[PDB]
Design a protein around this ligand. Structure first.
Ligand SMILES: O=C(O)C[C@H](S)C(=O)O
Ligand SMILES: O=C(O)C[C@H](S)C(=O)O
Ligand code: SF4
Ligand code: SF4
Lengths: 531, 532
């Protein structure tokens, strides 16, 4: 009566649908052997270093076809909004610059995540975590990436690790003699849009589930740089299993799952509800960041078994910095997924002078409604999470709001490392909502009247800008390389240099595009689509 | 220069602080060999079946010392409330019954979870998932446990799998030649109290974090049968990593982590904030289910590294059915954690309600008493939980009446485990009440569900419904399923929907069934102050 049924039964478990290139000469790192009658593979652990280094180098300069096709679709679709096409064109042009292998596609080169599947008879010497980490360390140290990891010295005292370690190393024990991998360079803001809901049987009917999807999609907002790859997981054997599954779904790792369930509880993709998710995304009007049809590239919906008392639900996105790369080691060597190296084949405003007293800039912005495109020319002061927290603490101790918060628009951003001979490394915006708790306070103390970042913000920011005569400008989210190449002319560290990329910067910019998202009158570009 | 630092650096990675018993004769399943100069272990995969079967048998009848000590503390502490002592005594007596190896400690024998760590040179043949699953299958099939897993035939059509499979099998590749395990029989309602928050640097100061903890602990309520082992994880490299870590923390798997961080971002346990979590839990007044000090047994707080843009936070509990067991396979055979076989060593006023009356007379009697009154129920209960409620609502949406069997007796939210030979009932404690909240006003408007019996605090809509319709919600003690079955449940019959398995509608006869009036017919709620 016993019948074993694996929860996940992909028809393409080894991802034969993906194209791989072999690392030249890498057969020297492997040797097929036969031990106690079974075929085994000896793997020099240096192969893990070589592989992780190339994976976390390639993934920052190239994209998958399904991602690039989505941007082209947003440009060519007659039903796309003007802003849809503008954002998608900008992101495609950014990808063309990133393909030069100098500037990464996003300033947030992400957390390094490794999903590894080591066969029973794949023998590495066992130090896999160290050798993978060395390859990751090499990639972030010797390329123009960013150190984004924050170590906790105690509960509240933190420092940057200075090398983008530690990585997340999830190494699984599986049958066979190969070693199979998924490498993910996961952006922080898209990682933040991984949500867990604890639901019930009352959700599991067509009307309730549709309404749930409509409600939860809006909570993604534009804070993770859409168009999104949207993943939705209904059910699971635990919260952590649901959230792992929705991460992998967003990487299209489970595309080959069955599409029907059975009495043993196997996982399945649900194409009918993927289409419903896409209908909700298109009809939302949220669009590719600034209103339209292209909130989502595509959708993945996976239905999982559940304890009768339980219904965990996971929702997650892959952002414009859609960065994953499959790989495997076998008796022939090291194979790595081939990304698109020629993204160019997929391609088919009010001037604001910042070199003035800030009150004159505010006066000019007050002449325009939300949704107006602007082009900024002049100085920006750059500050994000830790700098804002340190400045609030200073004011709580009776110190003034610093002069540099009162002279220029505040750009929420943290740069990647500067290539030799370049004025700036990749340097796109940070999610604005994380700074919302500071805006009324800083404006009440005479600063932060104009902020520049990406993503929709909470009502407290709209209220603050109306009370204090402020503005929130939305940069396009994601196009960090083209912003650096074309707009950023000078970069200087202003304060808190120990914070690394989170230091306060002073930058000089030209032709920096943005939209007026929140004005000084109570209006919000997102008030209709993200209410 | 490059310096590798593992995130997790326990000082006791093989859990030497835990006592293990050897499975007699199990060295016959292993053989030490040497290939390419390296020591390897051949393991007969039948060892995986034997180990999983014993693990998911033992864990339903015995508890760890730190769990039992927590119940004893709630009895002996002068600061414990009278209800704290009553609940902890009931749970200890339940454990004494479960130690008889016939009735499981809870009717929810849980989801079977296996965390495995297979050494590079531990050679099983590779069919680990099947052989582990067979042992789990054996444990749930041939013992008086419960089939709790629900398969999705399509997005909405469901059926019970009938064997408590599939299991969650997380098998990791690690150094060496051994095989190490943590087995968890995870209750559904405590699994539901695993929460993920997406926070920011603005949280990471003493005032904000303390207020956050106070707010979020209240959202656990009593819905997962406290006293809780409370686990809190601040940070993490991804949502799924944070939630895995908070699960393992609640199982005390990370107790030997360092207690300080470093510039490489290693994880650490934070004893100062564990003490703060315990102070918040104690001062909340929520107590061991019915007001008092013993909301929590103990706390685990793990601080993790984070991307500068990110601060995932995990909060989770282990419930009264605190069920995990460590194990390992090595050159000497199969070893399994030794749980406490003699829980009795930890052991040191009510209104009688006759349910064998017209339901309106029972309502009239209950209306005489305030919330917090302890009652003892004698008579018939109609038993229905999530799927039966959904099916009955669907019938009503299609124009059918509320069934008469929903109008004659109080409704007990519960699903029984299998009945031992010669017993009137298997373990048969209550289901979480909150999951049925959306049905109460509707059913009461149609003349039924005026009195409900379950565990956990409920939402405001239920308080409002009971005031509008002259209803009551009675809180059973949560967790003591074996002593309820042994002493209180006298007859069990299936009344409707037999295809739902444990989720069928049952008609049961009970005696001396304890409960508290949680919501009355006047707008009052026993939890309105502690869980406001
Ligand atoms: O770290 C970054 O630069 C981008 C992320 S998405 C953020 O700040 O929200
Ligand atoms: O399944 C059970 O019997 C107990 C769980 S905790 C529940 O239903 O709330
Ligand atoms: S594309 Fe946007 S969300 Fe994604 S990593 Fe870059 S800034 Fe963050
Ligand atoms: S003790 Fe309570 S929460 Fe835990 S499994 Fe049993 S009924 Fe569910």
């Amino acid at each position: 009566d016993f019948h074993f049924s694996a929860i996940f039964q992909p028809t393409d478990p080894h991802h034969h649908q993906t194209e791989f290139a072999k690392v030249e000469g890498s057969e020297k790192y492997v040797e097929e052997v036969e031990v106690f009658g079974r075929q085994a593979l000896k793997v020099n652990p240096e192969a893990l270093t070589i592989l992780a280094h190339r994976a976390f180098s390639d993934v920052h300069h190239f994209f998958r076809k399904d991602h690039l096709e989505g941007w082209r679709r947003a440009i060519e679709d007659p039903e796309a909004s003007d802003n849809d096409r503008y954002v998608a064109t900008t992101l495609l042009k950014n990808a063309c610059i990133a393909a030069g292998r100098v500037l990464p596609s996003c300033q947030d080169t992400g957390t390094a995540i490794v999903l590894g599947k080591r066969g029973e008879l794949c023998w590495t010497g066992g130090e896999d975590e160290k050798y993978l980490s060395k390859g990751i360390w090499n990639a972030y140290r010797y390329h123009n990436l960013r150190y984004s990891q924050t170590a906790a010295l105690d509960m509240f005292k933190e420092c940057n690790t200075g090398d983008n370690l530690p990585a997340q190393l999830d190494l699984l024990a599986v049958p066979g003699s190969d070693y199979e991998f998924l490498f993910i360079a996961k952006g922080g803001g898209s990682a933040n849009k991984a949500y867990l809901y604890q639901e019930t049987k009352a959700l599991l009917n067509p009307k309730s589930l549709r309404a749930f999807i409509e409600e939860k999609l809006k909570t993604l907002g534009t804070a993770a740089c859409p168009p999104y790859h949207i993943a939705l997981v209904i059910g699971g054997t635990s919260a952590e299993m649901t959230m792992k599954t929705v991460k992998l779904a967003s990487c299209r790792y489970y595309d080959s799952l069955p599409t029907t369930g059975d009495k043993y509880g196997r996982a399945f993709r649900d194409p009918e509800w993927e289409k419903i998710v896409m209908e909700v995304a298109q009809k939302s009007g949220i669009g590719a960041q600034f209103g339209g049809k292209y909130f989502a590239h595509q959708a993945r919906v996976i239905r999982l078994p559940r304890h009768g008392a339980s219904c965990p639900v996971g929702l997650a996105v892959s952002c414009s910095a859609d960065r994953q790369i499959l790989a495997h080691i076998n008796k022939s060597g090291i194979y790595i997924e081939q990304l698109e190296q020629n993204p160019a084949q997929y391609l088919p405003s009010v001037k604001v002078d910042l070199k003035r007293p800030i009150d004159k800039v505010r006066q000019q912005l007050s002449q325009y409604p939300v949704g107006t495109r602007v082009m900024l020319n002049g100085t920006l002061i750059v500050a994000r999470d830790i700098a804002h927290a340190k400045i609030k603490e200073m004011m709580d101790n009776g110190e003034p709001l610093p002069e540099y918060m009162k002279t220029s628009p505040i750009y929420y951003a943290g740069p990647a490392k500067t290539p030799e001979g370049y004025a700036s490394g990749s340097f796109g915006p940070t999610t604005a909502g994380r700074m919302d708790s500071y805006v009324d306070l800083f404006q009440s103390h005479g600063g932060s009247y104009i902020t520049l970042a990406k993503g929709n913000r909470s009502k407290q920011v709209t209220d603050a800008c109306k009370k204090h005569g402020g503005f929130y400008l939305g940069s396009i989210g994601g196009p960090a390389a083209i912003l650096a190449k074309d707009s950023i002319k000078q970069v200087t560290c202003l304060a808190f240099p120990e914070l690394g990329m989170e230091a306060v910067w002073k930058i000089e910019v030209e032709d920096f595009p943005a939209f007026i998202v929140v004005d000084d009158k109570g209006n919000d570009m997102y008030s209709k689509t993200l209410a």
